[PDB]
Amino acid sequence: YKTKPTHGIGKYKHLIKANLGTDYEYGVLNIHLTAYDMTLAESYAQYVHNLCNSLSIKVEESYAMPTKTIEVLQLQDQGSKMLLDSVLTTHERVVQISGLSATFAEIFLEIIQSSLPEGVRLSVKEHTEEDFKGRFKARPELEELLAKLK
């Protein structure tokens, strides 16, 4: 009861959660992992995802990019017609992180590049300006947002 000293003991929503990058922290980073081997690209992203959690770094999203198929054509022996030799598939994995301090950036960048396996490309770009963060919303999430406007 409100008048009782034990009022508010059952309150729980204040313990439940309902981007801009400052001059001290990086806002949004997209870690692109390009490699022709699908197992190596998936594994390194898995290691980075585990590494970020261990260092108390929030991972916004872990997804993959569409595969880019590149045919390799080589000149025929004593001729002028290009013949098919091999087909290479380009696989890319993206790990998005947010909440990285400027000072800790040097340590984080050194750890990932040291652990980068052979044949895997590391590419981190500031894509906070791109935005386009269109994600499908659930009903309980959407209901609360409308109540704010109402």
Binding site: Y24, L75, A105, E118
Partner: protein
Amino acid sequence: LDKARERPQVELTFEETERRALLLKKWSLYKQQERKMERDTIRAMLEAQQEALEELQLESPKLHAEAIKRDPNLFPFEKEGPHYTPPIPNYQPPEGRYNDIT
């Protein structure tokens, strides 16, 4: 989806199963030390970095605020993985053509 690509599953001998089983238990301890070294490596970098900043603040408070700011020129950062063999100083690749399929 065709089942004609399926291969016969040859039965595994007890020695092979024993060898695999004992190999996985030793591999779990091997990976535990790599994380332990990596965990201490990060702490060693982090502890020295924080302590160096403390000394800089007393020496010069204005230089302390300049180092702790972000570096927009740092990103984007590109880095390639190592190779298996060093590049050949004198190598002429054969001629060819690339076609991309999307």
